[PDB]
Amino acid sequence: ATLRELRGRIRSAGSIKKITKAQELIATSRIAKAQARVEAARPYAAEITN
Protein backbone atom coordinates (compact mmCIF):
# COMPACT_ATOMS: atom_id res chain seq x y z
CA ALA A 1 0.00 0.00 0.00
CA THR A 2 3.07 2.24 0.10
CA LEU A 3 2.98 2.79 -3.66
CA ARG A 4 -0.77 3.48 -3.67
CA GLU A 5 -0.38 6.03 -0.87
CA LEU A 6 2.53 7.69 -2.68
CA ARG A 7 0.52 7.89 -5.91
CA GLY A 8 -2.39 9.46 -4.06
CA ARG A 9 -0.04 11.99 -2.51
CA ILE A 10 1.43 12.75 -5.93
CA ARG A 11 -2.04 13.48 -7.30
CA SER A 12 -2.84 15.65 -4.28
CA ALA A 13 0.40 17.60 -4.65
CA GLY A 14 -0.25 18.11 -8.35
CA SER A 15 -3.66 19.58 -7.59
CA ILE A 16 -2.18 21.86 -4.92
CA LYS A 17 0.53 22.96 -7.35
CA LYS A 18 -1.95 23.86 -10.07
CA ILE A 19 -4.11 25.81 -7.63
CA THR A 20 -1.14 27.71 -6.20
CA LYS A 21 0.19 28.64 -9.64
CA ALA A 22 -3.25 29.91 -10.66
CA GLN A 23 -3.53 31.94 -7.46
CA GLU A 24 -0.06 33.37 -8.04
CA LEU A 25 -1.05 34.62 -11.49
CA ILE A 26 -4.32 36.02 -10.15
CA ALA A 27 -2.40 37.86 -7.44
CA THR A 28 -0.02 39.18 -10.09
CA SER A 29 -2.96 40.76 -11.90
CA ARG A 30 -4.46 42.00 -8.62
CA ILE A 31 -1.23 43.84 -7.82
CA ALA A 32 -1.66 45.84 -11.03
CA LYS A 33 -5.28 46.54 -10.12
CA ALA A 34 -4.28 47.79 -6.66
CA GLN A 35 -1.49 49.97 -8.04
CA ALA A 36 -3.96 51.47 -10.51
CA ARG A 37 -6.29 52.27 -7.62
CA VAL A 38 -3.45 53.94 -5.71
CA GLU A 39 -2.59 56.04 -8.76
CA ALA A 40 -6.25 57.01 -9.16
CA ALA A 41 -6.35 58.15 -5.53
CA ARG A 42 -3.11 60.14 -5.79
CA PRO A 43 -4.42 63.44 -7.28
CA TYR A 44 -7.20 64.05 -4.76
CA ALA A 45 -4.76 63.43 -1.91
CA ALA A 46 -2.18 65.82 -3.36
CA GLU A 47 -4.66 68.61 -4.04
CA ILE A 48 -6.43 68.30 -0.68
CA THR A 49 -3.01 68.48 0.94
CA ASN A 50 -2.44 71.72 -0.98
Place this chain on the structure above:
Amino acid sequence: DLNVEIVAVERELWSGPATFVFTRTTAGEIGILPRHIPLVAQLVDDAMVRVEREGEDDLRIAVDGGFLSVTEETVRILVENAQFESEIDADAAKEDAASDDERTAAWGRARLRALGQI
Protein backbone atom coordinates in the same frame (compact mmCIF):
# COMPACT_ATOMS: atom_id res chain seq x y z
CA ASP B 1 -13.88 79.27 -20.62
CA LEU B 2 -12.35 77.66 -17.53
CA ASN B 3 -11.16 74.13 -16.76
CA VAL B 4 -13.51 72.31 -14.39
CA GLU B 5 -12.20 69.17 -12.67
CA ILE B 6 -14.56 66.99 -10.66
CA VAL B 7 -12.10 64.96 -8.57
CA ALA B 8 -13.26 62.29 -6.14
CA VAL B 9 -11.26 60.53 -3.44
CA GLU B 10 -11.38 57.12 -5.11
CA ARG B 11 -10.62 58.51 -8.58
CA GLU B 12 -10.50 61.62 -10.72
CA LEU B 13 -13.98 61.73 -12.22
CA TRP B 14 -14.25 64.44 -14.86
CA SER B 15 -12.14 67.15 -16.46
CA GLY B 16 -12.89 69.63 -19.21
CA PRO B 17 -13.58 73.20 -20.27
CA ALA B 18 -16.80 74.93 -19.30
CA THR B 19 -18.45 78.34 -19.49
CA PHE B 20 -20.04 78.63 -16.04
CA VAL B 21 -19.97 76.64 -12.78
CA PHE B 22 -22.94 77.04 -10.43
CA THR B 23 -23.03 75.52 -6.95
CA ARG B 24 -24.07 76.22 -3.36
CA THR B 25 -21.36 76.86 -0.78
CA THR B 26 -22.10 77.05 2.93
CA ALA B 27 -23.13 80.71 3.00
CA GLY B 28 -25.15 80.51 -0.20
CA GLU B 29 -25.25 79.99 -3.93
CA ILE B 30 -22.26 80.89 -6.09
CA GLY B 31 -21.46 81.15 -9.77
CA ILE B 32 -17.94 80.91 -11.17
CA LEU B 33 -17.01 82.55 -14.48
CA PRO B 34 -13.69 82.30 -16.34
CA ARG B 35 -11.53 84.80 -14.41
CA HIS B 36 -13.16 84.46 -10.99
CA ILE B 37 -10.85 85.30 -8.08
CA PRO B 38 -8.96 82.62 -6.13
CA LEU B 39 -11.37 81.03 -3.68
CA VAL B 40 -11.73 78.06 -1.34
CA ALA B 41 -15.19 77.11 -0.12
CA GLN B 42 -17.17 74.19 1.29
CA LEU B 43 -20.21 73.00 -0.63
CA VAL B 44 -23.44 72.53 1.29
CA ASP B 45 -23.96 69.00 2.59
CA ASP B 46 -26.60 68.37 -0.10
CA ALA B 47 -24.94 70.46 -2.78
CA MET B 48 -25.36 70.27 -6.54
CA VAL B 49 -22.99 71.41 -9.29
CA ARG B 50 -24.13 72.70 -12.69
CA VAL B 51 -21.33 72.98 -15.25
CA GLU B 52 -22.54 74.87 -18.32
CA ARG B 53 -20.31 74.18 -21.33
CA GLU B 54 -19.93 75.71 -24.78
CA GLY B 55 -21.65 73.64 -27.44
CA GLU B 56 -22.86 71.05 -24.93
CA ASP B 57 -25.65 70.54 -22.43
CA ASP B 58 -25.58 71.41 -18.74
CA LEU B 59 -23.73 68.93 -16.53
CA ARG B 60 -25.61 68.32 -13.27
CA ILE B 61 -23.67 66.57 -10.50
CA ALA B 62 -24.93 65.43 -7.10
CA VAL B 63 -22.05 65.98 -4.66
CA ASP B 64 -21.51 64.40 -1.24
CA GLY B 65 -19.43 66.43 1.20
CA GLY B 66 -17.38 68.22 -1.45
CA PHE B 67 -15.16 71.29 -1.56
CA LEU B 68 -14.55 73.99 -4.16
CA SER B 69 -11.27 75.64 -5.15
CA VAL B 70 -11.19 78.37 -7.78
CA THR B 71 -7.60 78.84 -8.90
CA GLU B 72 -6.05 81.40 -11.24
CA GLU B 73 -6.90 79.14 -14.20
CA THR B 74 -9.02 76.16 -13.14
CA VAL B 75 -11.92 75.27 -10.85
CA ARG B 76 -11.44 72.08 -8.84
CA ILE B 77 -14.38 70.35 -7.15
CA LEU B 78 -13.53 67.75 -4.51
CA VAL B 79 -16.08 65.09 -3.66
CA GLU B 80 -16.35 62.10 -1.39
CA ASN B 81 -18.89 60.86 -3.94
CA ALA B 82 -20.08 62.73 -7.03
CA GLN B 83 -22.78 61.25 -9.25
CA PHE B 84 -23.42 62.52 -12.77
CA GLU B 85 -26.88 63.39 -14.05
CA SER B 86 -27.43 60.29 -16.18
CA GLU B 87 -26.57 58.01 -13.24
CA ILE B 88 -29.20 59.17 -10.71
CA ASP B 89 -32.33 57.14 -10.06
CA ALA B 90 -35.39 59.11 -8.97
CA ASP B 91 -36.78 56.30 -6.82
CA ALA B 92 -33.86 55.79 -4.44
CA ALA B 93 -33.03 59.50 -4.18
CA LYS B 94 -36.61 60.49 -3.37
CA GLU B 95 -36.89 57.61 -0.89
CA ASP B 96 -33.71 58.66 0.94
CA ALA B 97 -35.42 61.95 1.78
CA ALA B 98 -36.78 62.43 5.31
CA SER B 99 -34.74 59.44 6.50
CA ASP B 100 -33.59 59.29 10.11
CA ASP B 101 -29.94 59.37 9.02
CA GLU B 102 -28.89 62.90 8.12
CA ARG B 103 -26.21 61.93 5.58
CA THR B 104 -28.63 59.70 3.66
CA ALA B 105 -31.24 62.46 3.50
CA ALA B 106 -28.58 64.95 2.39
CA TRP B 107 -27.43 62.63 -0.39
CA GLY B 108 -31.03 62.11 -1.51
CA ARG B 109 -31.56 65.87 -1.55
CA ALA B 110 -28.42 66.30 -3.64
CA ARG B 111 -29.68 63.71 -6.13
CA LEU B 112 -33.07 65.43 -6.30
CA ARG B 113 -31.42 68.80 -6.92
CA ALA B 114 -29.29 67.25 -9.66
CA LEU B 115 -32.40 65.78 -11.29
CA GLY B 116 -34.31 69.06 -11.03
CA GLN B 117 -37.19 67.79 -8.89
CA ILE B 118 -35.85 69.86 -5.98
Place this chain on the structure above:
Amino acid sequence: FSLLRDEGKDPVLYVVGRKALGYFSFRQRTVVESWTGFSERPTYENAREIA
Protein backbone atom coordinates in the same frame (compact mmCIF):
# COMPACT_ATOMS: atom_id res chain seq x y z
CA PHE C 1 2.18 48.57 21.88
CA SER C 2 5.50 48.15 23.67
CA LEU C 3 6.52 51.69 22.71
CA LEU C 4 3.25 53.07 24.07
CA ARG C 5 3.77 51.09 27.27
CA ASP C 6 7.16 52.80 27.54
CA GLU C 7 5.36 56.16 27.30
CA GLY C 8 2.93 55.01 30.00
CA LYS C 9 -0.01 54.81 27.59
CA ASP C 10 -2.41 51.89 27.24
CA PRO C 11 -3.11 51.17 23.55
CA VAL C 12 -6.78 51.15 22.53
CA LEU C 13 -7.22 48.72 19.68
CA TYR C 14 -9.17 48.99 16.43
CA VAL C 15 -8.84 46.34 13.73
CA VAL C 16 -9.40 45.98 9.99
CA GLY C 17 -9.45 42.44 8.64
CA ARG C 18 -10.31 39.05 10.09
CA LYS C 19 -6.75 37.83 10.69
CA ALA C 20 -5.94 40.51 13.24
CA LEU C 21 -9.28 39.74 14.88
CA GLY C 22 -8.25 36.12 15.30
CA TYR C 23 -4.81 37.08 16.59
CA PHE C 24 -6.12 39.45 19.26
CA SER C 25 -8.99 37.14 20.20
CA PHE C 26 -6.41 34.44 20.86
CA ARG C 27 -4.41 36.92 22.94
CA GLN C 28 -7.67 38.05 24.65
CA ARG C 29 -6.82 41.70 23.92
CA THR C 30 -10.02 43.67 23.43
CA VAL C 31 -10.96 45.21 20.08
CA VAL C 32 -13.04 48.35 20.49
CA GLU C 33 -14.35 48.13 16.92
CA SER C 34 -13.68 46.02 13.85
CA TRP C 35 -14.38 46.33 10.13
CA THR C 36 -13.87 43.35 7.83
CA GLY C 37 -14.66 42.17 4.33
CA PHE C 38 -13.02 44.88 2.23
CA SER C 39 -9.25 44.55 2.71
CA GLU C 40 -9.06 43.18 -0.83
CA ARG C 41 -10.79 46.18 -2.45
CA PRO C 42 -11.33 48.91 0.14
CA THR C 43 -13.60 51.78 -0.88
CA TYR C 44 -13.73 55.31 0.46
CA GLU C 45 -16.90 54.38 2.36
CA ASN C 46 -14.99 52.05 4.67
CA ALA C 47 -12.13 54.51 5.15
CA ARG C 48 -14.60 57.30 5.91
CA GLU C 49 -16.36 55.17 8.52
CA ILE C 50 -13.08 54.14 10.15
CA ALA C 51 -11.71 57.68 10.24
Place this chain on the structure above:
Amino acid sequence: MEVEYVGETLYSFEPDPETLFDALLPRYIATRVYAALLEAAASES
Protein backbone atom coordinates in the same frame (compact mmCIF):
# COMPACT_ATOMS: atom_id res chain seq x y z
CA MET D 1 -1.03 66.10 13.61
CA GLU D 2 2.10 68.19 14.01
CA VAL D 3 2.91 71.45 12.19
CA GLU D 4 5.71 72.11 9.70
CA TYR D 5 6.60 75.65 8.64
CA VAL D 6 8.07 76.74 5.30
CA GLY D 7 9.24 80.27 4.56
CA GLU D 8 7.75 80.28 1.06
CA THR D 9 -3.08 87.27 -4.88
CA LEU D 10 -4.12 86.04 -1.44
CA TYR D 11 -6.85 83.42 -1.45
CA SER D 12 -10.46 84.21 -0.58
CA PHE D 13 -11.92 81.92 2.07
CA GLU D 14 -15.66 81.27 2.32
CA PRO D 15 -17.04 81.70 4.94
CA ASP D 16 -13.82 82.06 6.94
CA PRO D 17 -10.53 80.17 7.22
CA GLU D 18 -11.31 78.65 10.62
CA THR D 19 -14.53 76.88 9.66
CA LEU D 20 -13.02 75.52 6.45
CA PHE D 21 -9.96 74.29 8.35
CA ASP D 22 -12.16 72.54 10.91
CA ALA D 23 -14.33 70.94 8.22
CA LEU D 24 -11.31 69.91 6.12
CA LEU D 25 -8.94 68.40 8.70
CA PRO D 26 -11.20 65.38 9.41
CA ARG D 27 -11.58 65.00 5.65
CA TYR D 28 -7.79 64.99 5.37
CA ILE D 29 -7.55 62.23 7.98
CA ALA D 30 -10.18 60.23 6.09
CA THR D 31 -8.09 60.64 2.93
CA ARG D 32 -4.97 59.45 4.75
CA VAL D 33 -6.80 56.41 6.12
CA TYR D 34 -8.04 55.59 2.63
CA ALA D 35 -4.51 55.87 1.24
CA ALA D 36 -3.24 53.60 4.01
CA LEU D 37 -5.93 51.04 3.17
CA LEU D 38 -5.05 51.16 -0.53
CA GLU D 39 -1.36 50.64 0.22
CA ALA D 40 -2.28 47.77 2.53
CA ALA D 41 -4.34 46.14 -0.22
CA ALA D 42 -1.53 46.47 -2.76
CA SER D 43 0.99 45.07 -0.28
CA GLU D 44 -1.35 42.20 0.53
CA SER D 45 -1.70 41.29 -3.14
Place this chain on the structure above:
Amino acid sequence: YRELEAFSDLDAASKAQLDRGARLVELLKQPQYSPLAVEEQVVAIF
Protein backbone atom coordinates in the same frame (compact mmCIF):
# COMPACT_ATOMS: atom_id res chain seq x y z
CA TYR E 1 -7.77 24.65 -22.72
CA ARG E 2 -6.06 22.18 -20.40
CA GLU E 3 -3.43 24.84 -19.67
CA LEU E 4 -6.13 27.36 -18.70
CA GLU E 5 -8.44 24.84 -17.02
CA ALA E 6 -7.23 26.03 -13.59
CA PHE E 7 -8.82 29.45 -14.19
CA SER E 8 -11.89 34.97 -15.25
CA ASP E 9 -9.71 38.08 -14.99
CA LEU E 10 -7.68 36.82 -17.96
CA ASP E 11 -6.82 38.22 -21.37
CA ALA E 12 -9.59 38.27 -23.94
CA ALA E 13 -7.60 35.66 -25.84
CA SER E 14 -7.38 33.47 -22.73
CA LYS E 15 -11.12 33.73 -22.07
CA ALA E 16 -11.84 32.88 -25.70
CA GLN E 17 -9.49 29.90 -25.49
CA LEU E 18 -11.23 28.68 -22.33
CA ASP E 19 -14.72 28.95 -23.82
CA ARG E 20 -13.64 27.40 -27.12
CA GLY E 21 -12.00 24.51 -25.31
CA ALA E 22 -15.10 23.88 -23.24
CA ARG E 23 -17.18 23.76 -26.41
CA LEU E 24 -14.68 21.45 -28.12
CA VAL E 25 -14.62 19.07 -25.15
CA GLU E 26 -18.41 18.97 -25.20
CA LEU E 27 -18.26 18.38 -28.96
CA LEU E 28 -15.95 15.37 -28.77
CA LYS E 29 -18.46 13.52 -26.57
CA GLN E 30 -20.55 10.80 -28.18
CA PRO E 31 -23.17 8.26 -27.05
CA GLN E 32 -22.73 4.51 -27.25
CA TYR E 33 -23.57 2.59 -30.43
CA SER E 34 -23.68 5.90 -32.34
CA PRO E 35 -20.89 5.93 -34.93
CA LEU E 36 -20.83 8.97 -37.21
CA ALA E 37 -20.13 8.97 -40.92
CA VAL E 38 -16.90 10.75 -41.78
CA GLU E 39 -18.74 13.66 -43.41
CA GLU E 40 -20.89 14.15 -40.31
CA GLN E 41 -17.75 14.19 -38.17
CA VAL E 42 -16.21 16.73 -40.54
CA VAL E 43 -19.24 18.99 -40.19
CA ALA E 44 -19.36 18.67 -36.39
CA ILE E 45 -15.65 19.46 -36.07
CA PHE E 46 -16.19 22.36 -38.47
Place this chain on the structure above:
Amino acid sequence: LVSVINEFKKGFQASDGSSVVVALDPEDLEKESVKVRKPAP
Protein backbone atom coordinates in the same frame (compact mmCIF):
# COMPACT_ATOMS: atom_id res chain seq x y z
CA LEU F 1 -29.59 10.15 37.00
CA VAL F 2 -30.39 13.28 34.99
CA SER F 3 -31.43 15.13 38.14
CA VAL F 4 -28.28 13.97 39.93
CA ILE F 5 -26.13 15.16 37.03
CA ASN F 6 -27.83 18.55 36.92
CA GLU F 7 -27.43 18.99 40.68
CA PHE F 8 -23.78 17.89 40.65
CA LYS F 9 -23.07 20.40 37.88
CA LYS F 10 -23.73 23.18 40.41
CA GLY F 11 -20.75 22.19 42.54
CA PHE F 12 -18.26 21.53 39.74
CA GLN F 13 -15.42 23.89 38.81
CA ALA F 14 -13.92 24.18 35.35
CA SER F 15 -10.18 24.73 34.97
CA ASP F 16 -10.79 28.49 34.95
CA GLY F 17 -13.42 28.07 37.68
CA SER F 18 -16.28 28.91 35.31
CA SER F 19 -19.68 27.38 36.00
CA VAL F 20 -20.77 24.37 33.95
CA VAL F 21 -24.45 24.75 34.87
CA VAL F 22 -26.43 25.18 31.66
CA ALA F 23 9.43 48.82 21.71
CA LEU F 24 9.17 50.57 18.35
CA ASP F 25 11.82 53.24 17.87
CA PRO F 26 10.12 56.67 17.97
CA GLU F 27 12.15 57.80 14.96
CA ASP F 28 10.67 54.99 12.85
CA LEU F 29 7.18 56.13 13.90
CA GLU F 30 6.37 58.46 11.02
CA LYS F 31 4.40 61.56 11.98
CA GLU F 32 1.64 63.16 9.95
CA SER F 33 2.08 66.92 9.64
CA VAL F 34 0.51 70.01 8.11
CA LYS F 35 2.57 71.96 5.59
CA VAL F 36 2.44 75.71 6.21
CA ARG F 37 4.03 78.52 4.17
CA LYS F 38 5.00 80.77 7.05
CA PRO F 39 8.25 81.95 8.63
CA ALA F 40 9.20 79.91 11.67
CA PRO F 41 7.34 81.82 14.42
Place this chain on the structure above:
Amino acid sequence: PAIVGDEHYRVAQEVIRILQRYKDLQDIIAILGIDELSEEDKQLVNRARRIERFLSQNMMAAEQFTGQPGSTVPLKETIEAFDKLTKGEFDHLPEQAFFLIGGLDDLAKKAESL
Protein backbone atom coordinates in the same frame (compact mmCIF):
# COMPACT_ATOMS: atom_id res chain seq x y z
CA PRO G 1 35.11 25.86 -21.11
CA ALA G 2 37.84 23.21 -21.08
CA ILE G 3 36.59 21.68 -24.35
CA VAL G 4 34.70 24.28 -26.40
CA GLY G 5 36.71 27.23 -25.07
CA ASP G 6 35.66 30.18 -22.96
CA GLU G 7 33.80 32.19 -25.60
CA HIS G 8 31.64 29.29 -26.80
CA TYR G 9 30.67 28.56 -23.20
CA ARG G 10 29.94 32.23 -22.53
CA VAL G 11 27.68 32.64 -25.56
CA ALA G 12 25.88 29.35 -24.92
CA GLN G 13 25.25 30.22 -21.27
CA GLU G 14 23.92 33.65 -22.23
CA VAL G 15 21.55 32.05 -24.74
CA ILE G 16 20.40 29.52 -22.14
CA ARG G 17 19.76 32.24 -19.55
CA ILE G 18 17.74 34.34 -22.00
CA LEU G 19 15.66 31.36 -23.12
CA GLN G 20 15.03 30.27 -19.53
CA ARG G 21 13.82 33.75 -18.60
CA TYR G 22 11.52 33.81 -21.63
CA LYS G 23 10.13 30.38 -20.74
CA ASP G 24 9.45 31.61 -17.21
CA LEU G 25 7.63 34.69 -18.51
CA GLN G 26 5.69 32.68 -21.11
CA ASP G 27 2.86 31.75 -18.73
CA ILE G 28 2.38 35.36 -17.60
CA ILE G 29 2.39 36.41 -21.26
CA ALA G 30 -0.22 33.83 -22.18
CA ILE G 31 -2.61 34.52 -19.30
CA LEU G 32 -2.19 38.14 -18.18
CA GLY G 33 -0.82 39.36 -21.53
CA ILE G 34 2.41 40.96 -22.68
CA ASP G 35 1.26 44.45 -21.68
CA GLU G 36 1.46 43.42 -18.02
CA LEU G 37 5.19 42.75 -18.30
CA SER G 38 7.57 45.65 -17.80
CA GLU G 39 9.53 47.21 -20.65
CA GLU G 40 12.64 45.32 -19.55
CA ASP G 41 10.66 42.07 -19.65
CA LYS G 42 9.12 43.03 -23.01
CA GLN G 43 12.51 43.64 -24.60
CA LEU G 44 13.87 40.45 -23.06
CA VAL G 45 10.91 38.58 -24.55
CA ASN G 46 11.55 40.07 -27.99
CA ARG G 47 15.24 39.17 -27.73
CA ALA G 48 14.44 35.60 -26.69
CA ARG G 49 11.89 35.17 -29.47
CA ARG G 50 14.49 36.29 -32.00
CA ILE G 51 17.10 33.96 -30.49
CA GLU G 52 14.81 30.93 -30.56
CA ARG G 53 13.76 31.70 -34.13
CA PHE G 54 17.43 31.94 -35.11
CA LEU G 55 18.08 28.57 -33.47
CA SER G 56 16.02 27.11 -36.31
CA GLN G 57 17.81 26.44 -39.58
CA ASN G 58 17.14 25.44 -43.16
CA MET G 59 18.23 21.80 -43.11
CA MET G 60 19.52 19.85 -46.09
CA ALA G 61 16.88 17.19 -45.38
CA ALA G 62 14.25 19.93 -45.76
CA GLU G 63 14.93 20.48 -49.47
CA GLN G 64 12.65 17.59 -50.41
CA PHE G 65 9.90 19.43 -48.50
CA THR G 66 10.70 23.05 -49.44
CA GLY G 67 12.46 24.44 -52.47
CA GLN G 68 15.35 26.07 -50.64
CA PRO G 69 18.43 23.89 -49.98
CA GLY G 70 20.01 23.42 -46.59
CA SER G 71 22.80 25.48 -45.07
CA THR G 72 25.96 24.77 -43.10
CA VAL G 73 27.14 27.28 -40.50
CA PRO G 74 30.76 27.24 -39.25
CA LEU G 75 31.01 27.02 -35.49
CA LYS G 76 32.79 30.37 -35.13
CA GLU G 77 30.17 32.14 -37.23
CA THR G 78 27.39 30.61 -35.14
CA ILE G 79 29.07 31.66 -31.90
CA GLU G 80 29.60 35.25 -33.02
CA ALA G 81 26.09 35.55 -34.48
CA PHE G 82 24.44 34.32 -31.30
CA ASP G 83 26.72 36.53 -29.20
CA LYS G 84 25.55 39.55 -31.17
CA LEU G 85 21.91 38.42 -30.98
CA THR G 86 22.13 38.14 -27.19
CA LYS G 87 23.78 41.56 -27.03
CA GLY G 88 20.70 42.90 -28.83
CA GLU G 89 22.20 43.95 -32.16
CA PHE G 90 19.32 42.65 -34.32
CA ASP G 91 16.16 43.43 -32.33
CA HIS G 92 15.22 46.11 -34.86
CA LEU G 93 14.98 43.37 -37.48
CA PRO G 94 11.61 41.60 -37.78
CA GLU G 95 10.98 38.21 -36.23
CA GLN G 96 10.24 36.42 -39.50
CA ALA G 97 13.74 37.28 -40.73
CA PHE G 98 15.17 34.69 -38.32
CA PHE G 99 13.24 31.63 -39.59
CA LEU G 100 15.05 28.84 -41.43
CA ILE G 101 18.35 30.46 -42.42
CA GLY G 102 22.03 29.86 -41.84
CA GLY G 103 24.64 32.45 -40.93
CA LEU G 104 24.67 36.23 -40.69
CA ASP G 105 24.73 36.63 -44.48
CA ASP G 106 21.39 34.85 -44.81
CA LEU G 107 20.05 36.95 -41.95
CA ALA G 108 21.07 40.14 -43.75
CA LYS G 109 19.61 39.00 -47.07
CA LYS G 110 16.30 38.05 -45.46
CA ALA G 111 16.41 41.44 -43.72
CA GLU G 112 16.42 43.30 -47.03
CA SER G 113 13.86 40.83 -48.37
CA LEU G 114 11.48 41.98 -45.61
